[PDB]
């Protein structure tokens, strides 16, 4: 067939490729620029949205769905990210493991205990998957263009990240609507 | 032009129309678009590329892994031209013709059929002949005259069939590129013959026990009587 | 027809002069001289034969053959397929789509690259009343007036 | 097949060898040229007076 | 191209060199809009025109150079866009297949889309300009001077907002050159 | 029943092994494929693609500090009539022209006045004759026609209107 | 019924109702290069914009970049970006091969090996 | 800005990336001067050194007229060929025959089939083999069924696939394209390598190819012709030239079956994931099939890979 049966796997020692370092037909790194997103005070979900769209490549006029060309976003200060009201305490994160006992219902607070970075990664996952699910390479490849640093110290001085100046137009606080 | 008929082949193979098969065209192998079903648009260069280059390699093609024939050797092509001569004209017949027209009508047509065919396949081999005069060998330069003689055809140096062009009007003639068809045969056979005489004297100048004595007696004798039959000297 | 030259060169027309299926003979009679007088450059070669191919055929200037099945088709139809032969250069068949409307892509001003609009920042129509600035005397008086006003109403 | 059906229009190339037979084929000369067989009416039998001679006082 | 025309001389001599060099047009044809260059080739929906004919196109939405841009409110006058009919042909078949699962009826509908394939020759433009136009305050500016910006443009930092996100200071204080000089 | 076996029998080359080998399987595959794509093409891709176009024009507006939501409205207001496809073409291949459109929108420049109701000339109400002449309304409308003839491009007719009206007197033989 | 996966336009700052009043367009673009787009009024009723060309705008961008990097120096990304602005201003053509290709093939200039097999700008018969 | 010194090779390698036209116009003058100095001093190293880098510099120029003129009057063909190991007799055959070769190269490279159609029509109205050069011999290549384009990565651990490639040459239906890119690439890794294996394998590669060129079976793209063929101002090496050719006669000689001889390791085998551009708006998937586009617009699309097969023979 076109796509092979013998496939690169997580248990297979060859390992899983990093799309930043990969060279493929649909990956263009030539015209990208680096952004700096300070997350102090900004709501988690909104930051996730903006980052998702710079990362995905949707902020460009010439953006094409099958051609993945993103900007690298360095998201700084994940720890100061603000989730409105009771939501830290009330907003679930649910996943289902395939095995007897398929429910993990885990509060934002617990995920924040383990890693703050995983929260931003989670909502980035959501905002990217909102337009891309049906193909793995289109889901996974953008996400590696996020650099999640939970405070103001990052390795990336050499890329001269341009401060991304953004104000959220939405006045009201974020609202959790998931069926 | 890949699958069906090569550069120096003797087939006339029509690539676009399948005239040799036993079955209707069921599955078209090279196809680009799904609109190829009801209007394949073959005849465009870019689609007949895709069709003709997807055909299986023939006995003519000799596909990549398989070892192919050494065709462009002059030493193959000349006995090839010669085996055409024994086809139309039988040995007996040849003898009767050698003597000196009283011949069976039926028989006569075989002589002119020999002339016809020999003309044709000279037309086919000359693009491979013109490649090879350079490394051709002393016996098979002479074979060029032997084979024309045996087929009862006189070579144009300025009976002979090789002098005239086949008639047709230049607007109606087939000029399509990629098909190797030399439109001036009597002009390029003539300067093939002159060339192959000129090379012969080179190798006879190059060639100057009893084996070499008898050989150099005999083939030197064969030169003037074979080139003399076509009216050429030296 | 590109740069004043027709891309069609030959039209092959095969027919049977005595046998049957009159349509091609009709076509030769009533519609062909109207075609030849209109497009003189196209060489039409006629092929009388006993069992005729009933298809029309064009030959273009890149060495491309194009043919249309004319079997028991009216000479009106044959004339029309002929005029369809002339009107094509037979180079391509692209679909009719939005991305295929323009055959080649070109920019007169230039193509968008990420760095042309990058170094622009938002600006203001009228100039800014800077926060840190030396207040003029009228300004002093007005602002102190305001502060004293709100302090007065509060107290 | 049928005139309408898409099976009609097939064989876009190959129906004719592109090359004239050097005996019977010829170019169309012009409007002054009399073609063998050509007649403005649909004659399935294109017989003239020479092929099918008619005997009567006057040609009808 | 016959040059631009205005009742003012300075504006004419100013914008005269502005109109030289390659021009692109935006053309309305058969409910399809086209970006059009000099040597470009388009496939418009079928026009009834003889092959190798010479055509002018009436509906022109926008015309611009490397330097000027003329935005037609709904249409423009003066634009000469001359093209040449190259082919008329039916393009690649779109086969539609209609079959209802309940019925045994299958319908094969071929859509070769008929089209006229057009090569373009000239784009000429000769506007009649009235005057300079103030864009922040709506007016026709009476006197025209090139050297002064029609509307000058000012940076945003009051100091009033603490939470205004700071883009790099060279982006925020950057003054832009005088183009018409 | 017509399933279109004899056309689709020629396509099989685009199918992998089991379908391209055996006939009926392949024909089922092709029937399914083409019916599916037909359905999809008529009802859906129309929306997907215009979604893409909207996205591109919108981001191109985002670079200029506004968005699709205002730009649509004020391309409507000022009667520009650029289709979104064309706005995409301008955004990608002529950024300066797109920018010019954006700043035509953002400016306060009066949008063109609504189209005029065609009005009766005053000279229609003049009774003719009063008490070999032309109705004055007719010659006024003739004027109005000749002016729009002279309005389109340069021509050998000249730009002077009067004698061009009187041009019928040069075909007149004086008795 | 399936979840809608088409792309969504970003939210845009809410109006203060000032926009409702006529003569106030609700597009607000006041930007760095804004004053350079000069509006003229055609006889048609259409407008005529005068704008700086492609390479002028990009040259302005280059000046702003250099002027922000005069202080701290130029970082590698700045280097690459300035290089590309400088190329696209002078372009005259279209570039179809990867930028890294030339560097990958010329790598032997960068890393020199021992002199036995050392490669030079002429090699054969030496 | 400083004279009284000839510019070394490194400089001309350096100025091949800058898109600034007056810079190149200046540097060309410098190149002329440097070559004449180097020829005066009779030192091969400086001269040949000045030829390689200079060659790249000439591929970087936009105007092909000035480039070809420059390459011929400074004689890059003969000089460059004299450097290689076994290409010697094919060196001087060029300088004997180039006056003849330049006669057969067509005026334009656009719409080739039409050109030779008219060139067929003239022949309907009432040979010592020279060096096979691809541009003069275009009419030959339409007669040929299969073209093997040679790439230098074949020479690793063995010569046998090349040897099996020249077994098919006498068939009359096949031809072997050998560019100056692969020749140079062969000679430079004949003297440079981790191993003593591929050096020998390149060493005899050169004499196999030289033999076939002298015998007039294979076909050669000289630097001068390479300049004309390749699109303006684009850099070309022993990766891209393979594909500029392979795109060329995929566009202009649609019936010739193009085979590519490479190593299963090699990068240039898959030109659309490697060797690509950026996301370029001025190119499309169909850009291979239009006559106006540059050749190197081809390799963004898989259609270049459709028409171009790559094989291991035996
Ligand atoms: Mg639709």
Tell me if residue G51 falls in helix, strand or coil.
Answer: coil
Closest CA to B67 of H167, G90, H300: H167
Which letter, b or e, does each residue of E147-180 get, where b requires 16 or more Cβ atoms within 10 Å of its Cβ? eebbbebebeeeeeeeeeeeebebbbebebeebb
- Do H271 and H305 form a contact (C-beta atoms < 8 A)? yes
Tell me if residue F30 falls in helix, strand or coil.
Answer: helix
> What count of other Cβ atoms lies within 10 Å of the Cβ of residue G39?
21
> What count of other Cβ atoms lies within 10 Å of the Cβ of residue H109?
18
Write out chain F residues lying below 8 Å of B37, CB-based: 7-8, 10-11
Question: A57 to chain H: nearest residue by CA?
Answer: H279
- Do H83 and H45 form a contact (C-beta atoms < 8 A)? no
Is beta strand G38-42 parallel, antiparallel or unpaired with respect to E114-124?
unpaired
Q: Which two tokens stand for residue B205?
A: 């100048």
Query: Residue E27 C-alpha to ligand 1 middle, in angstroms?
Result: 21
Residues 6 or more apart whose Cβ sits within 8 Å of residue E119: C2, E39, E40, E41, E83, E84, E86
Please list the residues that pair with E132 across neighbouring strands.
G40
Contact C44 D11 (CB under 8 A): no
Q: Provide the shortest C-alpha distance from residue F79 to chain G (in Å).
A: 10
DSSP codes, chain B: --SS--SS------SSS--S-SS-----SS--SGGGTT---BTBHHHHHHHHTTSPP-TTT--TTS-----S-HHHHHHHHHHHHHHHS-HHHHHHHHH-----HHHHHHHHHHHHHHHHHHHHHHHHHHHHTTT--HHHHHHHHHHHHHTT---------SSSPPP--TTTS---TTS---S-HHHHHHHHHHHHHHHHHHHHHHH---HHHHHHHHHHHHHHHHHTTTT---
DSSP class of A24? -
Backbone angles phi, psi at E56, to 5 degrees: -105, 145
Angle between helices F68-77 and F95-106 (to 10 degrees): 70
DSSP class of G100? H
Separation of alpha carbons H277 and H299, rounded Å: 8
Residues 6 or more apart whose Cβ sits within 8 Å of residue C28: C13, C15, C46, D35, D37, D38
CB distance from G54 to chain C under 8 Å?
Answer: yes
Separation of alpha carbons H157 and H161, rounded Å: 11
> What is the dihedral angle through the alpha carbons of F47, F45, E87, B31, rounded to the nearest 10 degrees?
170
- Do C22 and D43 form a contact (C-beta atoms < 8 A)? yes
- Do H47 and H38 form a contact (C-beta atoms < 8 A)? yes
Show which residues on chain C lie within 8 Å of chain H, measured between beta carbons.
61-63, 92, 94, 99, 103-107, 111-112
> What count of other Cβ atoms lies within 10 Å of the Cβ of residue A124?
24
Write out chain E residues lying below 8 Å of B35, CB-based: 92-95
Residues 6 or more apart whose Cβ sits within 8 Å of residue B24: none
Backbone angles phi, psi at B131, to 5 degrees: -70, -40
- Do A169 and G11 form a contact (C-beta atoms < 8 A)? yes
Residues with CB under 5 A from ligand 1 (ion): F 46
Q: Provide the shortest C-alpha distance from residue G110 to chain E (in Å).
A: 35
Contact E177 G53 (CB under 8 A): no
Separation of alpha carbons A140 and A151, rounded Å: 25
CB distance from C99 to chain G under 8 Å?
Answer: no
Is beta strand E32-36 parallel, antiparallel or unpaired with respect to E60-64?
unpaired
Is beta strand E54-56 parallel, antiparallel or unpaired with respect to E80-90?
antiparallel
Write out chain C residues lying below 8 Å of D4, CB-based: none
Q: Which two tokens stand for residue F159?
A: 């730009």
DSSP class of G9? P
Is beta strand E129-134 parallel, antiparallel or unpaired with respect to E139-140?
antiparallel
Experimentally, the structure was elucidated by: cryo-EM
**Helix or strand holding residue G47 (H, E):** strand G47-50
Is beta strand E80-90 parallel, antiparallel or unpaired with respect to E114-124?
antiparallel
Flag whether H touches D (3+ CB pairs, 8 A cutoff): no
Q: Which two tokens stand for residue G71?
A: 């202080």
Backbone angles phi, psi at C147, to 5 degrees: -60, -50
Tell me if residue F167 falls in helix, strand or coil.
Answer: helix
> What count of other Cβ atoms lies within 10 Å of the Cβ of residue F118?
5
- Do E118 and E55 form a contact (C-beta atoms < 8 A)? yes
Query: Residue F43 C-alpha to ligand 1 middle, in angstroms?
Result: 7
Separation of alpha carbons C30 and D42, rounded Å: 11
- Do H269 and H158 form a contact (C-beta atoms < 8 A)? no
Separation of alpha carbons F15 and B114, rounded Å: 51
Give, rounded to a whole angstrom, the gap between the first and last alpha carbons of chain C. 93
- Do B64 and H313 form a contact (C-beta atoms < 8 A)? yes
> What count of other Cβ atoms lies within 10 Å of the Cβ of residue C80?
14
Separation of alpha carbons E114 and A137, rounded Å: 39
Contact A31 C114 (CB under 8 A): yes
Sheet holding E129-134, edge to edge: E32-36, E24-29, E60-64, E68-71, G47-50, G38-42, E129-134, E139-140
Residues 6 or more apart whose Cβ sits within 8 Å of residue A97: A104
Resolution stated for this PDB structure, in Å: 3.4
- Among A82, A165, A167, A169, pick the best mutation site for testing chain E contact (most E Cβ within 10 A): A165
- Do G30 and C124 form a contact (C-beta atoms < 8 A)? yes
Burial class of residue A166, CB neighbours in 10 A (0-12, 13-18, 19+): middle
Is beta strand C8-15 parallel, antiparallel or unpaired with respect to A146-149?
unpaired
Q: Which two tokens stand for residue H189?
A: 């890794």
Question: F80 to chain G: nearest residue by CA?
Answer: G46
Burial class of residue H125, CB neighbours in 10 A (0-12, 13-18, 19+): exposed
DSSP codes, G14-45: PP-STTTSTT--S----BTTGGGSEEEEETTS
- Do B93 and B38 form a contact (C-beta atoms < 8 A)? no
Q: From residue A110, how far is each of A107, A113, B186, G100 by CA, in Å?
A: 5, 5, 95, 45
Q: Is the peptide bond before F145 cis (omega within 30 degrees of 0)?
A: no
Burial class of residue E68, CB neighbours in 10 A (0-12, 13-18, 19+): buried
Tell me if residue G111 falls in helix, strand or coil.
Answer: coil
> What is the dihedral angle through the alpha carbons of G126, H5, H7, H11, rounded to the nearest 10 degrees?
120
Burial class of residue C94, CB neighbours in 10 A (0-12, 13-18, 19+): middle
Burial class of residue G66, CB neighbours in 10 A (0-12, 13-18, 19+): middle
Separation of alpha carbons G13 and F172, rounded Å: 72
- Do B120 and B87 form a contact (C-beta atoms < 8 A)? no
Which pairs count as long-range contacts for G116-120, CB under 8 Å and 24+ apart, including other chains? G117/H191, G117/H192, G117/H193, G118/H192, G119/H188, G119/H191, G119/H192, G120/H45, G120/H49
Residues 6 or more apart whose Cβ sits within 8 Å of residue H150: H162, H165, H176, H177, H178, H179, H182, H209, H261
Residue for token digits 């065919």? B117
Contact A53 G78 (CB under 8 A): no
The conformational region for residue G14 under phi > 0 = left, psi -120 to 50 = alpha, else beta, is beta
Is beta strand D26-27 parallel, antiparallel or unpaired with respect to C123-124?
unpaired
Separation of alpha carbons H233 and H58, rounded Å: 9
Is beta strand E24-29 parallel, antiparallel or unpaired with respect to E60-64?
antiparallel
Q: Which two tokens stand for residue A177?
A: 């609507």
Residues 6 or more apart whose Cβ sits within 8 Å of residue E131: E6, E7, E8, E11, E140, E141, E142, E144, G40, G41
Residue for token digits 């100057």? B208
> What count of other Cβ atoms lies within 10 Å of the Cβ of residue A109?
12
Backbone angles phi, psi at C81, to 5 degrees: -70, -30
Q: Find how far residue E86's CA is from the centre of its chain.
A: 23
**Helix or strand holding residue E34 (H, E):** strand E32-36
Is beta strand H308-310 parallel, antiparallel or unpaired with respect to A162-163?
unpaired
Is beta strand E68-71 parallel, antiparallel or unpaired with respect to E60-64?
antiparallel
- Do C45 and D27 form a contact (C-beta atoms < 8 A)? yes
Burial class of residue D58, CB neighbours in 10 A (0-12, 13-18, 19+): exposed
Please list the residues that pair with C12 across neighbouring strands.
C45, C57
Closest CA to F54 of G27, G28, A61, A49: A61
Show which residues on chain B lie within 8 Å of chain H, measured between beta carbons.
1-2, 6-8, 45-46, 48-50, 52-53, 61-62, 64-65, 67-73, 127-128, 130-131, 134-135, 170, 173, 175-178, 180, 182-184, 195
Give, rounded to a whole angstrom, the gap between the first and last alpha carbons of chain F. 84
Q: Provide the shortest C-alpha distance from residue G79 to chain F (in Å).
A: 23
Q: Where are the alpha helices (DSSP H) in chain C?
A: 23-26, 32-38, 75-86, 137-154
Closest CA to C92 of H247, H304, B46: B46
Write out chain C residues lying below 8 Å of G55, CB-based: 110
Q: Provide the shortest C-alpha distance from residue E50 to chain B (in Å).
A: 24
Q: Give the 3-state DSSP-derived string for chain H, with helices as H, strands as E and coil as C.
A: CCCCCCCCHHHHHHCCCCCCHHHHHHHHHHHHHHHHHHHHCCCHHHHHHHHHHHHHHHHHCCCHHHHHHHHHHCCHHHHHHCCCCCCCHHHHHHHHHHHHHHHHCCCCCCCHHHHHHHHHHHHHCCCCCCCCECCCCHHHHCCCCEEEEECHHHCCCCCHHHHHHCCCHHHCCEEEEEEHHHHHHHHHCCCCCCCCCHHHHHHHHHHHHHHHHHHCCCEEECHHHHHHHCCCCCCCCCCHHHHHHHHHHHHCCCCCEEEEECCCCCHHHCCCCCCCCCCCCCCCCCCCCCCCCCHHHHHHCCHHHHHEEECCCC
Tell me if residue C46 falls in helix, strand or coil.
Answer: strand
Separation of alpha carbons E27 and H89, rounded Å: 61
**Helix or strand holding residue G85 (H, E):** helix G76-89
Tell me if residue F104 falls in helix, strand or coil.
Answer: helix
Tell me if residue A168 falls in helix, strand or coil.
Answer: coil
Sheet holding A146-149, edge to edge: A146-149, A72-76, A34-38, A162-163
Residues 6 or more apart whose Cβ sits within 8 Å of residue A32: A69, A70, A71, A72, C114
Residue for token digits 């898109």? H19
Tell me if residue F70 falls in helix, strand or coil.
Answer: helix
Separation of alpha carbons F140 and F124, rounded Å: 10
Tell me if residue C6 falls in helix, strand or coil.
Answer: coil
Q: Find how far residue G116's CA is from the centre of its chain.
A: 46
Q: Which two tokens stand for residue A178?
A: 């998931």
- Among G124, G125, G126, pick the best mutation site for testing chain H contact (most H Cβ within 10 A): G124
Q: From residue B101, how far is each of B105, B148, G47 by CA, in Å?
A: 11, 20, 96
Backbone angles phi, psi at H58, to 5 degrees: -70, -30
Separation of alpha carbons F39 and B96, rounded Å: 80
Question: C119 to chain A: nearest residue by CA?
Answer: A162
Closest CA to H71 of H107, H26, H18, H35: H35
Contact F59 A1 (CB under 8 A): no
Flag whether C touches H (3+ CB pairs, 8 A cutoff): yes
Please list the residues that pair with E82 across neighbouring strands.
E56, E122
Residues 6 or more apart whose Cβ sits within 8 Å of residue H269: H260, H262, H263, H310
DSSP codes, A97-141: -SSS---EEEEHHHHHHH-SHHHHHHHHHHHHHTT--S-HHHHHH
> What count of other Cβ atoms lies within 10 Å of the Cβ of residue A3?
5
Residue for token digits 């001389």? E9
Residues 6 or more apart whose Cβ sits within 8 Å of residue F97: C109, E24, E62, E64, E69, E71, F90
Separation of alpha carbons B188 and B125, rounded Å: 12
Q: What angle do CA E46, E48, E50 make, to 5 degrees?
A: 115
CB distance from C123 to chain F under 8 Å?
Answer: no
Please list the residues that pair with C14 across neighbouring strands.
C47
For CA atoms A110, A115, A118, A120, the dihedral sign is positive
> What count of other Cβ atoms lies within 10 Å of the Cβ of residue E101?
6
Separation of alpha carbons H195 and H153, rounded Å: 14
Q: Which two tokens stand for residue F44?
A: 């859906």
């Amino acid at each position: 067939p076109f796509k092979s049966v013998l496939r690169r796997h997580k248990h297979h020692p060859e390992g899983l490729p990093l799309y930043n370092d990969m060279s493929k037909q649909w990956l263009c790194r030539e015209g990208e620029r680096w952004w700096l997103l300070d997350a102090r005070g900004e709501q988690l979900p909104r930051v996730a949205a903006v980052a998702a769209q710079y990362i995905t490549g949707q902020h460009r006029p010439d953006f094409t769905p099958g051609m993945i060309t993103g900007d690298h976003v360095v998201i700084v200060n994940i720890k100061d990210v603000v989730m409105v009201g009771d939501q830290w305490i009330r907003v679930p994160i649910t996943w289902q493991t395939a095995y007897p006992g398929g429910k993990y219902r885990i509060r934002l607070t617990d995920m924040y205990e383990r890693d703050p970075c995983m929260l931003m990664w989670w909502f980035l996952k959501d905002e990217v998957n909102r337009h891309f699910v049906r193909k793995l390479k289109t889901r996974i490849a953008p996400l590696e263009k996020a650099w999640l640093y939970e405070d103001s110290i990052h390795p990336h001085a050499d890329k001269n990240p341009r401060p991304l100046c953004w104000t959220d137009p939405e006045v009201k606080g974020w609202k959790y609507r998931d069926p | 032009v890949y699958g069906g008929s090569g550069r120096g082949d003797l087939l006339y193979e029509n690539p676009d129309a399948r005239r040799h098969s036993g079955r209707a065209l069921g599955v078209l192998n090279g196809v680009r678009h799904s609109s190829q079903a009801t209007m394949p648009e073959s005849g465009q260069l870019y689609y007949r590329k895709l069709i003709l280059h997807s055909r299986p390699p023939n006995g003519s093609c000799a596909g990549l892994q398989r070892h192919c024939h050494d065709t462009c050797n002059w030493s193959y092509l000349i006995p090839s031209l010669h085996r055409c001569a024994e086809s139309a004209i039988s040995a007996k017949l040849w003898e009767k013709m050698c003597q000196l027209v009283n011949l069976t009508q039926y028989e006569r047509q075989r002589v002119r059929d020999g002339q016809n065919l020999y003309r044709y396949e000279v037309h086919q081999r000359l693009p491979l002949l013109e490649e090879s005069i350079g490394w051709a060998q002393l016996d098979d330069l002479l074979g060029w005259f032997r084979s024309a003689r045996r087929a009862w055809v006189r070579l144009p140096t300025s009976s002979s069939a090789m002098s005239c062009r086949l008639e047709g009007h230049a607007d109606s003639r087939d000029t399509t590129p990629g098909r190797n068809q030399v439109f001036d045969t009597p002009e390029r056979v003539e300067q093939l013959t002159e060339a192959t005489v000129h090379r012969i004297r080179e190798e006879l100048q190059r060639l100057n026990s009893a084996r070499r004595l008898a050989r150099d007696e005999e083939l030197s004798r064969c030169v003037e009587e074979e080139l003399g039959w076509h009216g050429v000297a030296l | 027809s590109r740069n004043g030259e027709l891309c069609l060169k030959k039209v092959i027309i095969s027919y049977c002069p005595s046998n049957g299926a009159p349509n091609t003979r009709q076509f030769l009679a009533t519609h062909l001289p109207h075609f030849h007088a209109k497009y003189p450059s196209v060489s039409i070669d006629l092929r009388p034969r006993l069992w005729p191919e009933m298809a029309i055929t064009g030959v273009y200037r890149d060495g491309s053959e194009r043919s249309y099945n004319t079997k028991n088709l009216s000479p009106m139809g044959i004339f029309l397929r002929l005029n369809n032969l002339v009107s094509t250069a037979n180079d391509y068949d692209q679909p009719f789509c939005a991305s295929h409307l323009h055959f080649q892509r070109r920019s007169v001003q230039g193509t968008w690259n990420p760095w042309l609009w990058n170094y622009e920042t938002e600006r203001r129509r009228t100039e800014a009343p800077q926060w840190r600035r030396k207040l003029s005397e009228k300004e002093w008086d007005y602002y102190v007036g305001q502060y004293s006003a709100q302090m007065k109403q509060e107290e | 097949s049928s005139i309408f059906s898409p099976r009609y229009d097939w064989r876009t190339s190959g129906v004719h060898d592109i090359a004239p037979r050097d005996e019977g084929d010829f170019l169309y000369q012009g409007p002054q040229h009399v073609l063998p067989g050509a007649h403005p009416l649909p004659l399935h039998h294109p017989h003239n007076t020479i092929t099918r001679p008619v005997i009567s006082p006057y040609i009808p | 191209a016959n040059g631009l025309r205005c009742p003012d001389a300075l504006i004419t001599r100013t914008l005269n060199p502005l109109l030289n060099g390659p021009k692109f047009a935006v053309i309305y044809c058969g409910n399809h809009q086209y970006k059009v260059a000099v040597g470009d080739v388009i496939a418009v929906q079928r026009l009834r025109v003889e092959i190798g004919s010479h055509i002018a196109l009436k509906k022109v939405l926008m015309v611009g150079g490397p330097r000027f841009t003329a935005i037609g409110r709904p249409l423009l006058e003066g634009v000469r866009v001359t093209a040449q009919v190259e082919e008329q042909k039916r393009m690649r078949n779109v086969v539609s297949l209609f079959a209802t699962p309940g019925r045994r009826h299958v319908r094969w509908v071929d859509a070769p889309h008929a089209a006229t394939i057009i090569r373009i020759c000239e784009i000429f433009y000769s506007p009649n300009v009235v005057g300079e136009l103030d864009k922040y305050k709506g007016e026709l500016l009476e006197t025209f001077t090139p050297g002064q910006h029609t509307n000058p443009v000012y940076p945003v930092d009051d100091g009033y907002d603490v939470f205004r996100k700071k883009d790099k200071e060279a982006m925020e204080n950057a003054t832009t050159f005088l183009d018409l000089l | 029943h017509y399933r279109a076996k004899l056309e689709l029998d020629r396509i099989r080359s685009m199918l992998r092994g089991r379908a391209r080998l055996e006939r009926k399987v392949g024909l089922k595959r092709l029937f399914f494929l083409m019916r599916t794509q037909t359905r999809y093409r008529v009802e859906q891709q129309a929306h997907w693609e215009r979604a893409i176009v909207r996205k591109n024009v919108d981001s191109a507006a985002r670079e200029h500090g506004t968005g699709w939501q205002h730009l649509r409205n004020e391309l409507g207001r000022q009667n520009v009539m650029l289709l979104p496809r064309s706005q995409q073409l301008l955004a990608q291949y002529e950024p300066l022209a797109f920018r010019a459109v954006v700043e035509l929108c953002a400016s306060r420049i009066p949008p063109p006045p609504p189209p005029v109701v065609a009005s009766v000339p005053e000279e229609s109400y003049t009774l003719w004759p009063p008490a070999s002449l032309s109705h004055p309304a007719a010659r006024v409308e003739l004027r109005c026609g000749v002016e729009r003839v002279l309005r389109r491009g340069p021509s050998g007719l000249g730009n002077n209107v009067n004698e061009l009206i009187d041009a019928w007197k040069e075909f007149d033989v004086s008795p | 019924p399936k979840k809608d996966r088409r792309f969504r336009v970003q939210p845009l700052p809410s109006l203060h109702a000032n926009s409702l009043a006529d003569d106030t367009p609700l597009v607000t673009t006041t930007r760095t290069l804004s004053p350079n787009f000069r509006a003229f009024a055609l006889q048609d009723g259409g407008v005529f914009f005068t704008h700086p060309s492609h390479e002028q705008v990009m040259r302005v961008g280059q000046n702003i970049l250099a002027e922000e990097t005069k202080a701290t120096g130029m970082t590698s990304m700045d280097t690459y970006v300035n290089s590309r602005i400088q190329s696209i201003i002078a372009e005259n053509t279209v570039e179809n091969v990867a930028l890294s290709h030339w560097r990958r093939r010329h790598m032997w200039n960068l890393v020199r090996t021992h002199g036995k097999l050392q490669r030079h700008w002429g090699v054969s018969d030496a | 800005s400083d004279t009284a010194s000839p510019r070394g090779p490194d400089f001309f390698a350096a100025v091949s990336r800058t898109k600034d036209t007056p810079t190149k116009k200046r540097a060309l003058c410098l190149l002329q001067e440097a070559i004449d100095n180097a020829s005066a001093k009779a030192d091969k190293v400086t001269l040949l050194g000045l030829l390689e880098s200079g060659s790249e510099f000439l591929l970087s120029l936009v105007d092909k007229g000035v480039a070809h003129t420059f390459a011929t009057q400074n004689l890059f063909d003969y000089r460059i060929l004299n450097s290689f190991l076994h290409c010697s007799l094919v060196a001087d055959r060029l300088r004997v025959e180039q006056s003849v070769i330049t006669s057969l190269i067509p005026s334009s490279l656009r719409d080739v089939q039409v050109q030779m159609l008219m060139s067929n029509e003239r022949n309907a109205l009432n040979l010592k083999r020279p060096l096979m050069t691809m541009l003069s011999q275009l009419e030959y290549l339409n007669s040929i069924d299969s073209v093997f384009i040679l790439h230098s990565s074949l020479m690793a651990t063995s010569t046998d696939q090349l040897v099996s490639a020249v077994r098919r040459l006498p068939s009359g239906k096949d031809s072997l394209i050998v560019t100056m890119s692969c020749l140079r690439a062969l000679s430079v890794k004949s003297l440079t390598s981790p191993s003593m294996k591929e050096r020998i394998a390149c060493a005899r590669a050169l004499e196999i190819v030289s033999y076939e060129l002298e015998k007039g079976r294979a076909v050669l793209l000289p630097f001068s012709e390479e300049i004309l063929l390749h699109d303006a101002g684009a850099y070309c090496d022993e990766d891209l030239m393979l594909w500029t050719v392979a795109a060329f006669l995929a566009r202009e000689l649609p019936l010739v079956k193009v085979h590519t001889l490479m190593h299963s390791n090699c990068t240039a085998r898959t030109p659309y994931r490697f060797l690509k551009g950026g996301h370029n708006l001025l190119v499309s998937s169909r850009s291979l099939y239009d006559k106006g586009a540059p050749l190197l617009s081809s390799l963004h699309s898989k259609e270049l890979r459709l028409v171009t097969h790559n094989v291991r023979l035996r």
